[PDB]
Design a protein around this ligand. Structure first.
Ligand SMILES: CC(C)CCC[C@@H](C)[C@H]1CC[C@H]2[C@@H]3CC=C4C[C@@H](O)CC[C@]4(C)[C@H]3CC[C@]12C
Ligand SMILES: CC(C)CCC[C@@H](C)[C@H]1CC[C@H]2[C@@H]3CC=C4C[C@@H](O)CC[C@]4(C)[C@H]3CC[C@]12C
Ligand SMILES: CC(C)CCC[C@@H](C)[C@H]1CC[C@H]2[C@@H]3CC=C4C[C@@H](O)CC[C@]4(C)[C@H]3CC[C@]12C
Ligand SMILES: CCCCCCCC/C=C\CCCCCCCC(=O)OC[C@@H](O)CO
Ligand SMILES: CCCCCCCC/C=C\CCCCCCCC(=O)OC[C@H](O)CO
Ligand SMILES: CCCCCCCC/C=C\CCCCCCCC(=O)OC[C@H](O)CO
Ligand SMILES: CCCCCCCC/C=C\CCCCCCCC(=O)OC[C@H](O)CO
Ligand SMILES: CCCCCCCC/C=C\CCCCCCCC(=O)OC[C@H](O)CO
Ligand SMILES: CCCCCCCC/C=C\CCCCCCCC(=O)OC[C@H](O)CO
Ligand SMILES: CCCCCCCC/C=C\CCCCCCCC(=O)OC[C@H](O)CO
Ligand SMILES: Nc1nc(NCCc2ccc(O)cc2)nc2nc(-c3ccco3)nn12
Ligand SMILES: CCCCCCCC/C=C\CCCCCCCC(=O)O
Ligand SMILES: CCCCCCCC/C=C\CCCCCCCC(=O)O
Ligand SMILES: CCCCCCCC/C=C\CCCCCCCC(=O)O
Ligand SMILES: CCCCCCCC/C=C\CCCCCCCC(=O)O
Ligand SMILES: CCCCCCCC/C=C\CCCCCCCC(=O)O
Ligand SMILES: CCCCCCCC/C=C\CCCCCCCC(=O)O
Ligand SMILES: CCCCCCCC/C=C\CCCCCCCC(=O)O
Ligand SMILES: CCCCCCCC/C=C\CCCCCCCC(=O)O
Ligand SMILES: CCCCCCCC/C=C\CCCCCCCC(=O)O
Ligand SMILES: CCCCCCCC/C=C\CCCCCCCC(=O)O
Ligand SMILES: CCCCCCCC/C=C\CCCCCCCC(=O)O
Ligand SMILES: CCCCCCCC/C=C\CCCCCCCC(=O)O
Ligand SMILES: CCCCCCCC/C=C\CCCCCCCC(=O)O
Ligand code: NA
Length: 390
């Protein structure tokens, strides 16, 4: 068995590399939101909270991880704090991700109500509440759900620890039932599944709304044909009644509203002539709709489509961040499940424990790269900061 300092040196070196990168990338994120008013919106207040948690990974959770890797002698409740602080950050991250998803669902479902419901002041309150809850959840073990009452007396004496002290090792102080049922199942997996559900609802709303835009467009175009080759005022009247319903429903800002007012007015003109039995006049009147379509209605359609496609692209980007969080944390959670549920299975080896821990920390590096690659407004602001300063 090789001197422990050799593997420990590799682990510590990698941890420090990750800490540096987590700090730099997430400071860049915060700086970009600070500088650019185009990035100052409610969604991004949660992005900044998430970035703050990742900065705290580099500044605090990584130094604490290095420390607990040594098994140093510590008062048991101080050892718990060192062990569990990262759980606070990871819970805050989960709350920020959940908020972003909900935020984007409100935005796609009730866009005319979004700015009145989802305000900066309300978002700051939610963020504050979520941090408090993250402290309560992550430090639950320090309220007495811990193994400090059942110390490993053999380890503790071999190591030379004093009174009230334990060899500070994660699995010796933090109960595995806590880690599996409370931390993993209740506080991580349930919220991740809820996020999956919210994102599926966002994509279903986008698809339905885009389908409706197309359907209304087709209705207009198809009924203009019904009118053109109609042979009586009744056939023209019936097409025009359906066009009016589709025009009024689509209507549900200046050039937009003027366009739809022209359209309804022109439909009403044709409806009047059709009710009077003036078939050719109604047909001539209905053809005038084509000017309004071409000048106004098509432009509205293309703009509505474009807004919705942008929301789908944006939701995919945010969903990727959720996926990478799951990728990075799941291995550690899964290992804990094997340790807990399979006492006849050999414990995962030390090298794998440390690989899983390092992977979990690497999550705090990745989000700035996702913003840079997938969100133009962040990318452009990052370039301006880097070019001007560093
Ligand atoms: C605002 C930030 C920068 C302050 C950081 C304070 C941190 C480093 C402090 C707060 C509480 C401290 C712990 C409290 C109790 C103990 C038990 C003792 O037997 C060993 C040290 C240990 C485990 C301490 C290590 C350092 C510690 C984690
Ligand atoms: C979320 C994605 C990346 C899946 C990752 C799955 C990883 C964490 C899985 C795949 C196979 C698993 C291993 C399969 C077999 C054993 C042997 C055992 O006695 C302890 C656990 C251990 C060592 C498992 C640990 C968890 C493990 C390594
Ligand atoms: C996040 C999504 C993918 C769900 C996560 C799936 C998790 C909870 C699943 C995936 C693999 C599963 C493990 C597969 C095999 C064993 C060995 C058995 O003796 C005890 C249960 C245990 C240890 C399972 C516990 C639950 C488990 C870890
Ligand atoms: C030490 C551990 C963590 C440090 C947390 C960093 C705190 C991060 C705050 C950044 C910020 O406020 O920028 C964006 C807003 O101004 C937008 O209005
Ligand atoms: C041991 C010491 C205790 C840990 C100290 C700090 C944890 C980090 C908490 C960071 C909270 C920041 C929340 C935030 O900055 O979000 C504001 C919002 O984005 C408005 O725009
Ligand atoms: C900026 C803010 C950064 C905060 C500082 C970061 C990490 C320090 C954590 C280290 C805690 C180390 C405890 C080690 C200890 O107590 O050592 C006892 C030893 O057994 C006696 O020989
Ligand atoms: C910044 C000040 C934050 C207040 C200090 C919080 C950290 C602390 O005092 O922790 C006690 C310790 O965990 C007991 O074991
Ligand atoms: C809801 C969250 C409330 C958060 C408030 C948390 C309640 C405080 C519990 C506490 O004081 O912990 C003491 C600790 O056990 C010393 O050994
Ligand atoms: C999602 C929620 C996961 C809920 C699934 C909960 C299933 C857990 C059942 C269980 O833990 O089995 C008891 C057995 O004795 C092992 O110790
Ligand atoms: C979704 C998570 C559901 C996964 C729940 C995993 C249950 C595992 C389990 O019940 O293990 C029992 C143990 O193996 C008995 O000896
Ligand atoms: N199981 C576990 N162990 C450790 N550190 C100790 C690795 C180890 C495990 C066994 C051993 O004999 C010596 C060291 N950190 C840990 N962090 C987590 C964790 C954080 C979030 C979810 O799981 N689980 N976890
Ligand atoms: C992810 C990026 C690559 C990771 C490179 C390897 C990192 C960690 C594995 C190190 C194995 C040694 C673990 C022993 C740690 C200890 O006893 O303190
Ligand atoms: C880059 C940082 C270099 C870290 C050196 C770690 C050695 C500490 C040790 O294992 O005793
Ligand atoms: C890892 C992340 C890459 C860091 C990009 C360079 C940023 C330097 C400026 C800053 O950190 O504020
Ligand atoms: C270590 C943790 C420190 C994280 C710092 C994150 C940087 C985020 C925002 C920088 C803005 C701070 C206020 C300086 C503004 C100066 C100015 O307005 O010109
Ligand atoms: C500004 C704030 C900067 C804080 C820097 C704090 C010091 C950093 C790391 C302290 C390392 C802990 C030393 C433990 C030595 C244990 C021993 O001597 O037995
Ligand atoms: C800044 C460099 C930090 C060097 C880290 C050394 C940790 C040594 C140790 O684990 O005792
Ligand atoms: C930007 C601020 C960054 C904060 C600086 C953190 C650097 C310190 C890193 C690791 C400290 C590890 C101390 C080792 C534990 C003591 C080992 C032992 O007593 O057996
Ligand atoms: C701010 C960063 C602080 C600068 C240097 C930290 C040096 C860390 C030394 C850890 C000592 C651990 C040990 O001696 O066993
Ligand atoms: C002092 C700020 C931190 C608030 C404590 C959070 C504790 C969590 C408990 C319950 C969640 C809902 C609390 C809402 C209270 C404020 C509501 C309001 O004034 O509109
Ligand atoms: C942005 C900061 C938000 C405020 C968060 C602080 C709220 C703390 C809530 C619960 C803490 C529970 C942990 C109790 C610590 C016990 C200490 C001990 O054992 O002596
Ligand atoms: C747990 C995931 C919930 C799945 C959401 C289903 C989508 C829907 O309601 O139409
Ligand atoms: C990254 C590559 C690691 C992928 C899978 C890990 C599988 C190794 C498991 C070793 C089993 C030892 C044991 O039986 O406890
Ligand atoms: C980019 C950083 C990705 C980190 C690890 C590999 C995961 C690849 C993610 C695919 C999306 C990347 C992108 O949008 O350009
Ligand atoms: Na995080």
């Amino acid at each position: 068995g090789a001197p422990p300092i050799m593997g420990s040196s590799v682990y510590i070196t990698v941890e420090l590399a990750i800490a540096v990168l987590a700090i730099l990338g997430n400071v860049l994120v915060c700086w970009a939101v600070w500088l650019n008013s185009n990035l100052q919106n409610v969604t991004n207040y949660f992005v900044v909270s998430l970035a703050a948690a990742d900065i705290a990974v580099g500044v605090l959770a990584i130094p604490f991880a290095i420390t607990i890797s040594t098994g140093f002698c510590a008062a048991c409740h101080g050892c718990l704090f060192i062990a569990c602080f990262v759980l606070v950050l990871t819970q805050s991250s989960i709350f920020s991700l959940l908020a972003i998803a909900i935020d984007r669902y409100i935005a796609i479902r009730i866009p005319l109500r979004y700015n009145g419901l989802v305000t900066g002041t309300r978002a700051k309150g939610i963020i504050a509440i979520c941090w408090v809850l993250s402290f309560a959840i992550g430090l639950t073990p320090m309220l007495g759900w811990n193994n400090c009452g059942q110390p490993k007396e053999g380890k503790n004496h071999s190591q030379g620890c004093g009174e009230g002290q334990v060899a500070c090792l994660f699995e010796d102080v933090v109960p595995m039932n806590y880690m599996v049922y409370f931390n993993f199942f209740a506080c991580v997996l349930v919220p991740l599944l809820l996020m999956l559900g919210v994102y599926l609802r966002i994509f279903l709303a986008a698809r339905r709304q885009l389908a409706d835009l197309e359907d209304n467009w087709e209705t207009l175009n198809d009924n203009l044909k019904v009118i053109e080759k109609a042979d009586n005022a009744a056939q023209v009247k019936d097409a025009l009644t359906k066009m009016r319903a589709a025009a009024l429903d689509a209507q549900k800002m200046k050039d937009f509203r003027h366009g739809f007012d022209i359209l309804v007015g022109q439909i009403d003109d044709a409806l009047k002539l059709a009710n009077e039995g003036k078939v050719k006049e109604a047909q001539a009147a209905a053809e005038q709709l084509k000017t309004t379509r071409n000048a106004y209605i098509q432009k509205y359609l293309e703009r509505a489509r474009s807004t919705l496609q942008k929301e789908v692209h944006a939701a995919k980007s945010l969903a990727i961040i959720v996926g990478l969080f799951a990728l990075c944390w799941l291995p550690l959670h899964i290992i804990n499940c094997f340790t807990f549920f399979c006492p006849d299975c050999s414990h995962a080896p030390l090298w794998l424990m440390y690989l899983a821990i390092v992977l979990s920390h690497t999550n705090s590096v990745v989000n700035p790269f996702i913003y840079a690659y997938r969100i133009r407004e962040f990318r452009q602001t990052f370039r301006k900061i880097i070019r001007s300063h560093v």
